[PDB]
């Protein structure tokens with residue numbers, strides 16, 4: 378646990394869990410710049426999110442510093458100063474396609490780690506990818522994440538809150554089953570987002586209309602300027618049948634070979 382007197386918070390909001398604030402945390406002889414999730418049943422969720430983060434250790438996943446019991450419960454994390462990927466790309470339209478390939482490949486490496494560790498993320502979107510630099514992305518926001526049982530390859534949802542339906546695979550919507558393959562679908566949407574410079578997917582559509590469109594075999598179009606091979610990978614990620622859709626090992630390898638082949 379973290380001592381509250383060693384933590385200082387700026388009061389400007391960076392971002393229903395509550396708010397995210399920037400702060401500084403004195404660690405031995407220095408200060409560390411931190412991002413802090415502040416709580417506005419809900420106590421258990423933050424401590425659950427912290428318990429998932431504590432278990433993960435990978436260069437493409439945000440590192441948690443610790444939790445802080447003070448005026449409210451707080452999850453203290455290493456600050457990713459460039460912020461959410463979607464917003465960055467909205468404000469930086471000059472970013473080159475090789476640079477976007479590099480960043481989504483990094484997300485796929487982090488997700489391959491998550492899949493090996495038998496964790497489902499359940500909220501994989503461009504808003505939950507954080508940029509440490511313009512060439513270094515990290516996955517964050519493990520508020521819906523679950524550690525799968527040793528003998529199971531999906532989490533069965535009981536709790537039916539407000540879901541990020543536009544990022545969810547058909548099996549999550551129709552049967553409430555969330556697997557790593559379900560995260561691969563989300564990853565496809567994240568890729569569409571990245572090459573669309575942070576535009577919202579399925580613009581102006583209700584979740585129910587998105588579900589109808591997908592059942593017809595329809596999918597989002599190729600974003601302007603997107604390499605063909607990356608649009609193709611998006612379509613593979615959006616394979617309707619779970620057994621036919623690739624896992625993250627296959628997805629990361631495809632991105633890795635394509636990225637390394639760029640001249």
Ligand SMILES: Cc1ccc(Nc2nc(N[C@@H]3CCOC[C@@H]3N)ncc2C(N)=O)cc1
Pocket residue numbers: 391392397412439454455456457458459460461504505506507517518
């Ligand atoms: C503008 C800005 C800069 C840094 C961050 N940092 C983080 N944000 C989150 N969560 C956010 C919740 C609101 O929606 C956007 C984000 N998903 N989580 C972790 C960090 C971090 N460790 O830096 C947010 C906004």
